[PDB]
Amino acid sequence: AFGSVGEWLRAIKMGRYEESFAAAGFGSFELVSQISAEDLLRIGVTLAGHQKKILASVQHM
Numbered sequence: 001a002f003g004s005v006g007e008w009l010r011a012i013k014m015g016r017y018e019e020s021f022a023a024a025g026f027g028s029f030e031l032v033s034q035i036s037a038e039d040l041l042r043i044g045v046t047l048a049g050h051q052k053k054i055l056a057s058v059q060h061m
């Protein structure tokens with residue numbers, strides 16, 4: 001378990017997206033667990049490799 005979405009993003013080397021997750025309203029794991037590729041694109045994860053890494057990480061929840 002992570003203490004916050006930030007801690008999670010940081011842990012999976014995706015800390016660069018912290019502010020953009022938070023501003024888009026993804027501040028709980030309940031929301032992030034339902035995240036899709038379209039969501040990731042909307043908030044600014046433009047790289048498919050980062051999208052894949054993020055989505056593979058959430059598929060654990």
Ligand SMILES: [Cl-]
Nearest residue numbers: 004005006007
């Ligand atoms: Cl934090």
